[PDB]
Design a protein around this ligand. Structure first.
Ligand SMILES: Nc1ncnc2c1ncn2[C@@H]1O[C@H](COP(=O)(O)OP(=O)(O)OP(=O)(O)O)[C@@H](O)[C@H]1O
Lengths: 361, 239
């Protein structure tokens, strides 16, 4: 209440400052200009208003499609308001704060290296690649076995140099509203160019990328709104973009978005996935988990779990501590959990052996 | 939709119709068996006898010869196929070269025949397995197994079916090296596993013992009825 006392007591200066700008209702878009003084403007009341502008604002600052203030009495232009947009749709689009730093990598070197130089390196040293130009590529792509998905995008969040970047997923842009995706991708780059340093990311393009055409009834044609328009908006020249966006998905499908990207995008890499000598790297970050006995050999259990990435062997050190408390013991020796690891691979392969070959085949 | 392959097999590291046929093995009727210097014992359970039907039609053990006994776990459909098949095989073997090959010819017959049975097109692999019972020449025991992949292997103990039948083979490892020096306790192991395995009904349990070169006969409810009483007495001697 003491913080709310002086807080509520400030209305004396408020009502004095409430009289000015009170008439700003409502936000109105202009249309065209025949001469300098008079412009036609349209407001959400559905009523269009021709008016001149107050002497406090220069006429050159009024551009076609600019929402500006108003005086409901005189209808004259008051103050411009930068945002034209957008109802909702921002809260799931905007992503802030870091997490998942670079130390979480599972040993992949050349993979994470060449996708680091497409984003982090150009922005950290802009003069480098400009003098070294040539020209940076227009985009990237990610897909393969699930490990490691969606984490590599989280890697750039904690490695972000200055300002947070935008995350977008496909299913949030579904309709209901059609045309937001166009309007969205246009404004985020216009918002970008001011401060630059804002990445655009899209996830799960496979579901929304259904190609190409069917007899009827569509069907895929309403899905063509998502795939074709997004690629088309990516296909612009501006610039395009400064952050060179990003792409991530599950399967390479479909053919049409896959044949469109080589004309624009670049750097298509296939997971990778652990190397036989790289499975111990995910065990290195897990070697700091709980208390690890020095007799444990990570090279021994690595070969026993093929195609386990970092997700399935994350359960190894989990089942380690899992059965540790079940048995009331404290640490977990190699032979302890690996006896359960040979079970966790086979018993979980009874219903599905987790192949990815059958997905695209 | 339905996306799957058949043969062979899958990049995921495991076959399809083979290790999946092992599910049709482990789901088979619970059966056990042991080897000995003189009398070899076997067993079968989980036949779901309703007491109202005839026991000889559900019999799970046949004999190609008096020397070699057949024990299989799985459906009884493909059984008579193999019964007709293998009996003619051991017959044509009896025909020329009267002295038969010892234990390495017959165990590799069904095994290799089942391996090529997964080889050529238009041949669906069997989802059943089998374990050969009998006695090798010169007083030695013989036992082996059949695998969906066709790999023949010899076991010191026969444990299949549910987890309750695996305890019967666990009790054999508790007899160490010396036991048993009497055939009474070796038969009683089946009478003790009768309570552990299945529903403990005292009905589906059936066994036969072959002492040396003497052809075995199915146990009548007299001997096995007397050895069933000592099974509970021998467990009470350990208390
Ligand atoms: N080599 C690795 N190093 C670190 N973490 C890994 C590795 N491999 C897998 N993981 C972890 O396994 C988890 C599971 O990945 P997940 O299944 O979410 O990928 P995905 O996003 O489904 O892939 P896709 O988008 O291609 O379907 C991830 O959170 C990731 O952190």
């Amino acid at each position: 209440a003491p913080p709310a006392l002086w807080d509520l007591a400030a209305d004396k200066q408020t009502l004095q400052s409430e009289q000015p700008l009170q008439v700003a209702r409502c936000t109105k878009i202009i249309n065209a200009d025949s001469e300098d003084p008079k412009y036609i403007i349209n407001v959400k009341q559905f009523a269009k208003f021709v008016v001149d502008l107050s002497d406090q604002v220069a006429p050159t600052d009024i551009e076609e499609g600019m929402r500006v203030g108003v005086d409901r009495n005189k209808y004259q232009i008051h103050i411009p308001l930068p945002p034209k947009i957008d109802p909702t749709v921002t809260m799931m689009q905007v992503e802030e704060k870091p997490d998942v730093t670079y130390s979480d990598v599972g040993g992949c070197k050349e993979q994470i290296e060449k996708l680091r130089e497409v984003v982090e390196t150009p922005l950290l040293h802009p003069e480098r690649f400009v003098n070294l130009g040539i020209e940076p590529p227009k985009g990237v792509l990610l897909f393969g076995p699930p490990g490691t998905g969606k984490t590599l995008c989280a890697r750039a969040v904690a490695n972000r140099t200055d300002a947070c970047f935008i995350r977008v997923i496909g299913s949030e842009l579904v309709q209901k509203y059609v045309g937001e995706g166009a309007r969205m991708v246009r404004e985020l780059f216009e918002m970008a160019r001011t401060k630059k340093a804002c990445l655009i990311f899209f996830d799960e393009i496979d579901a929304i990328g259904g190609a190409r055409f069917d007899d009827g009834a569509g069907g895929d044609n309403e899905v063509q709104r998502t795939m074709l328009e997004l690629i088309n908006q990516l296909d612009g020249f501006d610039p395009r973009g400064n952050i060179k966006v990003l792409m991530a998905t599950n399967r390479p499908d479909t053919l049409d978005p896959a044949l469109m990207r080589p004309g624009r995008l670049d750097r298509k890499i296939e997971f990778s996935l652990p190397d036989l000598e790289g499975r111990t790297h995910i065990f290195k970050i897990h070697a700091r988990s709980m208390s690890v006995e020095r007799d444990i050999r990570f090279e021994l259990l690595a070969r026993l779990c093929p195609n386990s990435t970092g997700a399935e062997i994350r359960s190894v050190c989990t089942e380690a501590g899992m059965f540790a408390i079940r048995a009331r013991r404290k640490i977990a020796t190699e032979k302890d959990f690996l006896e359960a690891v040979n079970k966790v691979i086979k018993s979980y392969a009874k219903f599905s052996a987790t192949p990815r070959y059958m997905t695209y085949n | 939709s339905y996306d799957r392959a058949i043969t062979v097999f899958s990049p995921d590291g495991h076959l399809f119709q083979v290790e999946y046929a092992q599910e049709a093995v482990k789901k088979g009727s619970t059966a056990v068996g042991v080897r000995g210097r003189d009398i070899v014992v076997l067993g079968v359970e989980k036949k779901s006898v309703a007491k109202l039907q005839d026991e000889r039609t559900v019999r799970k053990i046949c004999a190609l010869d008096d020397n070699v006994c057949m024990a299989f776990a799985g459906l009884t459909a493909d059984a008579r196929i193999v019964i007709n098949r293998a009996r003619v095989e051991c017959q044509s073997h009896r025909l020329t070269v009267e002295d038969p090959v010892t234990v390495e010819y017959i165990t590799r017959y069904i095994a290799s025949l089942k391996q090529r049975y997964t080889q050529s097109n238009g041949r669906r692999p069997f989802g059943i397995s089998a374990l050969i019972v009998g006695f090798d020449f010169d007083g030695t025991p013989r036992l082996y197994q059949t695998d969906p992949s066709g790999t023949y292997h010899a076991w010191k103990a026969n444990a299949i079916g549910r987890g309750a039948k695996s305890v019967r083979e666990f009790l054999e490892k508790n007899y160490t090296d010396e036991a048993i020096e009497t055939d009474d306790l070796t038969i009683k192991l089946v009478i003790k596993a009768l309570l552990e395995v299945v529903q403990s009904g005292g009905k589906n349990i059936e066994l036969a013992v072959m002492r040396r070169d003497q052809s075995l006969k199915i146990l009548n409810p007299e001997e096995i009825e007397k050895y069933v009483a000592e099974i509970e007495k021998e467990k009470e001697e350990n208390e």
